PDB file of C-alpha atoms in Angstrom:
ATOM      1  CA  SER A   2     -48.797  -7.163 -63.973  1.00  0.00           C
ATOM      2  CA  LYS A   3     -51.023  -9.976 -61.996  1.00  0.00           C
ATOM      3  CA  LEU A   4     -48.325 -12.948 -62.228  1.00  0.00           C
ATOM      4  CA  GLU A   5     -45.590 -10.137 -60.687  1.00  0.00           C
ATOM      5  CA  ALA A   6     -48.182  -9.131 -58.369  1.00  0.00           C
ATOM      6  CA  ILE A   7     -48.775 -12.485 -57.231  1.00  0.00           C
ATOM      7  CA  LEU A   8     -44.986 -13.291 -56.807  1.00  0.00           C
ATOM      8  CA  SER A   9     -44.432  -9.716 -54.881  1.00  0.00           C
ATOM      9  CA  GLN A  10     -47.606 -10.917 -52.637  1.00  0.00           C
ATOM     10  CA  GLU A  11     -45.538 -13.790 -52.001  1.00  0.00           C
ATOM     11  CA  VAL A  12     -42.834 -11.837 -50.664  1.00  0.00           C
ATOM     12  CA  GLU A  13     -45.139  -9.338 -49.492  1.00  0.00           C
ATOM     13  CA  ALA A  14     -46.460 -12.434 -47.000  1.00  0.00           C
ATOM     14  CA  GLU A  15     -42.774 -12.580 -46.107  1.00  0.00           C
ATOM     15  CA  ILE A  16     -42.655  -8.801 -45.548  1.00  0.00           C
ATOM     16  CA  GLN A  17     -46.132  -8.982 -43.494  1.00  0.00           C
ATOM     17  CA  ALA A  18     -44.642 -11.708 -41.363  1.00  0.00           C
ATOM     18  CA  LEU A  19     -41.864  -9.415 -41.181  1.00  0.00           C
ATOM     19  CA  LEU A  20     -43.510  -6.265 -40.019  1.00  0.00           C
ATOM     20  CA  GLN A  21     -45.623  -8.999 -37.612  1.00  0.00           C
ATOM     21  CA  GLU A  22     -42.266 -10.009 -35.935  1.00  0.00           C
ATOM     22  CA  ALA A  23     -41.291  -6.205 -35.840  1.00  0.00           C
ATOM     23  CA  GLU A  24     -44.075  -5.279 -34.248  1.00  0.00           C
ATOM     24  CA  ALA A  25     -44.892  -7.972 -31.844  1.00  0.00           C
ATOM     25  CA  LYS A  26     -41.025  -6.982 -30.723  1.00  0.00           C
ATOM     26  CA  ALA A  27     -41.585  -3.379 -30.164  1.00  0.00           C
ATOM     27  CA  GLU A  28     -44.880  -4.567 -28.340  1.00  0.00           C
ATOM     28  CA  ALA A  29     -42.831  -6.846 -25.927  1.00  0.00           C
ATOM     29  CA  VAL A  30     -40.276  -4.060 -25.288  1.00  0.00           C
ATOM     30  CA  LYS A  31     -43.089  -1.462 -24.738  1.00  0.00           C
ATOM     31  CA  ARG A  32     -45.654  -3.387 -22.512  1.00  0.00           C
ATOM     32  CA  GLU A  33     -43.043  -3.801 -19.940  1.00  0.00           C
ATOM     33  CA  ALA A  34     -41.657  -0.616 -20.461  1.00  0.00           C
ATOM     34  CA  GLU A  35     -44.620   1.116 -19.475  1.00  0.00           C
ATOM     35  CA  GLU A  36     -44.966  -1.167 -16.631  1.00  0.00           C
ATOM     36  CA  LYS A  37     -41.346  -0.693 -15.393  1.00  0.00           C
ATOM     37  CA  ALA A  38     -42.388   3.231 -15.587  1.00  0.00           C
ATOM     38  CA  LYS A  39     -45.691   2.700 -13.187  1.00  0.00           C
ATOM     39  CA  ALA A  40     -43.381   0.349 -11.040  1.00  0.00           C
ATOM     40  CA  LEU A  41     -41.163   3.240 -10.635  1.00  0.00           C
ATOM     41  CA  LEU A  42     -43.776   5.536  -9.627  1.00  0.00           C
ATOM     42  CA  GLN A  43     -45.380   3.089  -7.293  1.00  0.00           C
ATOM     43  CA  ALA A  44     -42.000   2.510  -5.511  1.00  0.00           C
ATOM     44  CA  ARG A  45     -41.537   6.007  -5.176  1.00  0.00           C
ATOM     45  CA  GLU A  46     -45.010   7.250  -3.834  1.00  0.00           C
ATOM     46  CA  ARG A  47     -44.308   4.384  -1.359  1.00  0.00           C
ATOM     47  CA  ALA A  48     -41.133   5.659  -0.350  1.00  0.00           C
ATOM     48  CA  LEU A  49     -42.792   9.112  -0.116  1.00  0.00           C
ATOM     49  CA  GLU A  50     -45.480   7.500   2.201  1.00  0.00           C
ATOM     50  CA  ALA A  51     -42.864   5.610   4.627  1.00  0.00           C
ATOM     51  CA  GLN A  52     -41.395   9.161   5.072  1.00  0.00           C
ATOM     52  CA  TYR A  53     -44.848  10.759   5.924  1.00  0.00           C
ATOM     53  CA  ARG A  54     -45.610   8.343   8.758  1.00  0.00           C
ATOM     54  CA  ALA A  55     -42.283   8.968  10.261  1.00  0.00           C
ATOM     55  CA  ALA A  56     -42.671  12.659   9.745  1.00  0.00           C
ATOM     56  CA  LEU A  57     -46.140  12.616  11.846  1.00  0.00           C
ATOM     57  CA  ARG A  58     -44.897  10.057  14.505  1.00  0.00           C
ATOM     58  CA  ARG A  59     -41.792  12.193  15.146  1.00  0.00           C
ATOM     59  CA  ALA A  60     -43.829  15.737  15.057  1.00  0.00           C
ATOM     60  CA  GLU A  61     -46.362  14.349  17.716  1.00  0.00           C
ATOM     61  CA  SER A  62     -43.757  12.876  20.097  1.00  0.00           C
ATOM     62  CA  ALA A  63     -42.066  16.180  19.926  1.00  0.00           C
TER      63      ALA A  63
ATOM     64  CA  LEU B 252     -35.703 -47.207 -55.656  1.00  0.00           C
ATOM     65  CA  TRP B 253     -33.064 -46.386 -58.448  1.00  0.00           C
ATOM     66  CA  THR B 254     -35.388 -45.311 -61.092  1.00  0.00           C
ATOM     67  CA  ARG B 255     -36.654 -42.616 -58.696  1.00  0.00           C
ATOM     68  CA  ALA B 256     -33.331 -41.900 -57.302  1.00  0.00           C
ATOM     69  CA  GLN B 257     -32.042 -41.182 -61.024  1.00  0.00           C
ATOM     70  CA  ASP B 258     -34.760 -39.005 -61.582  1.00  0.00           C
ATOM     71  CA  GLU B 259     -34.441 -36.881 -58.685  1.00  0.00           C
ATOM     72  CA  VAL B 260     -30.722 -36.929 -59.127  1.00  0.00           C
ATOM     73  CA  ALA B 261     -31.100 -35.855 -62.927  1.00  0.00           C
ATOM     74  CA  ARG B 262     -33.784 -33.422 -61.309  1.00  0.00           C
ATOM     75  CA  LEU B 263     -31.156 -32.059 -59.021  1.00  0.00           C
ATOM     76  CA  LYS B 264     -28.336 -31.659 -61.586  1.00  0.00           C
ATOM     77  CA  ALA B 265     -30.897 -29.795 -63.970  1.00  0.00           C
ATOM     78  CA  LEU B 266     -31.241 -27.715 -61.248  1.00  0.00           C
ATOM     79  CA  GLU B 267     -27.573 -26.629 -61.416  1.00  0.00           C
ATOM     80  CA  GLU B 268     -28.539 -25.049 -64.814  1.00  0.00           C
ATOM     81  CA  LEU B 269     -30.974 -22.532 -63.651  1.00  0.00           C
ATOM     82  CA  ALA B 270     -30.641 -18.891 -64.106  1.00  0.00           C
ATOM     83  CA  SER B 271     -31.984 -17.209 -60.890  1.00  0.00           C
ATOM     84  CA  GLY B 272     -33.474 -13.552 -60.622  1.00  0.00           C
ATOM     85  CA  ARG B 273     -32.724 -12.623 -57.283  1.00  0.00           C
ATOM     86  CA  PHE B 274     -35.514 -14.427 -55.307  1.00  0.00           C
ATOM     87  CA  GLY B 275     -37.042 -15.695 -58.640  1.00  0.00           C
ATOM     88  CA  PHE B 276     -35.504 -17.643 -61.242  1.00  0.00           C
ATOM     89  CA  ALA B 277     -35.474 -18.126 -65.338  1.00  0.00           C
ATOM     90  CA  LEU B 278     -34.791 -21.113 -67.489  1.00  0.00           C
ATOM     91  CA  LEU B 279     -34.092 -21.379 -71.407  1.00  0.00           C
ATOM     92  CA  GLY B 280     -33.642 -23.829 -74.166  1.00  0.00           C
ATOM     93  CA  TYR B 281     -34.762 -25.274 -77.130  1.00  0.00           C
ATOM     94  CA  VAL B 282     -37.052 -27.710 -78.285  1.00  0.00           C
ATOM     95  CA  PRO B 283     -39.104 -29.156 -81.644  1.00  0.00           C
ATOM     96  CA  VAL B 284     -42.116 -27.170 -83.045  1.00  0.00           C
ATOM     97  CA  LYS B 285     -43.893 -30.528 -83.263  1.00  0.00           C
ATOM     98  CA  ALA B 286     -44.328 -30.772 -79.595  1.00  0.00           C
ATOM     99  CA  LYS B 287     -45.277 -27.131 -78.882  1.00  0.00           C
ATOM    100  CA  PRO B 288     -48.862 -28.199 -77.941  1.00  0.00           C
ATOM    101  CA  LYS B 289     -47.153 -30.282 -75.489  1.00  0.00           C
ATOM    102  CA  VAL B 290     -44.920 -27.568 -74.248  1.00  0.00           C
ATOM    103  CA  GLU B 291     -48.245 -25.693 -73.464  1.00  0.00           C
ATOM    104  CA  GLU B 292     -49.842 -28.515 -71.898  1.00  0.00           C
ATOM    105  CA  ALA B 293     -46.683 -28.855 -69.634  1.00  0.00           C
ATOM    106  CA  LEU B 294     -46.792 -25.087 -69.468  1.00  0.00           C
ATOM    107  CA  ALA B 295     -50.492 -24.986 -68.166  1.00  0.00           C
ATOM    108  CA  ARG B 296     -48.911 -26.556 -64.480  1.00  0.00           C
ATOM    109  CA  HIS B 297     -47.154 -23.330 -63.630  1.00  0.00           C
ATOM    110  CA  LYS B 298     -48.622 -21.669 -60.799  1.00  0.00           C
ATOM    111  CA  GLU B 299     -50.358 -18.936 -63.365  1.00  0.00           C
ATOM    112  CA  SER B 300     -48.761 -20.322 -65.995  1.00  0.00           C
ATOM    113  CA  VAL B 301     -45.790 -17.877 -65.368  1.00  0.00           C
TER     114      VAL B 301
END
C-alpha cells in the first residue's frame, strides 16, 4: 500500500543513491578509459610521423 | 540532567525489547481500553501513522 510504498521509497532513495554512486563509478572508469584510447592513437600516429620524416630525409640524401 | 538521562536510558533499555523486520521493526504489548483514545492520539505521531 501507500505506507509500504513510502518505506520502500526511503529504501529506493538509498537504492537510487546506490545506483548514482555505481553510475558515477562506471563513468569515472570510462571517461579516462576512452581518453587512454585516444592517447594511444595520438602517440601511435606521432611515432609513425617520426618514421615518415626519417624516411623522406634518408631517401632524398640517397 | 538526571531526569533526562534516566529517560533516555529507559528509552534505550526499551529499545532492547523491539522486534525487527529486516530494516523495519515491530513492537507489541498491552494497554487498557480506557486510554485507547490516548493510544490513537499517540499513534497519529507516527510517520503516516504506521
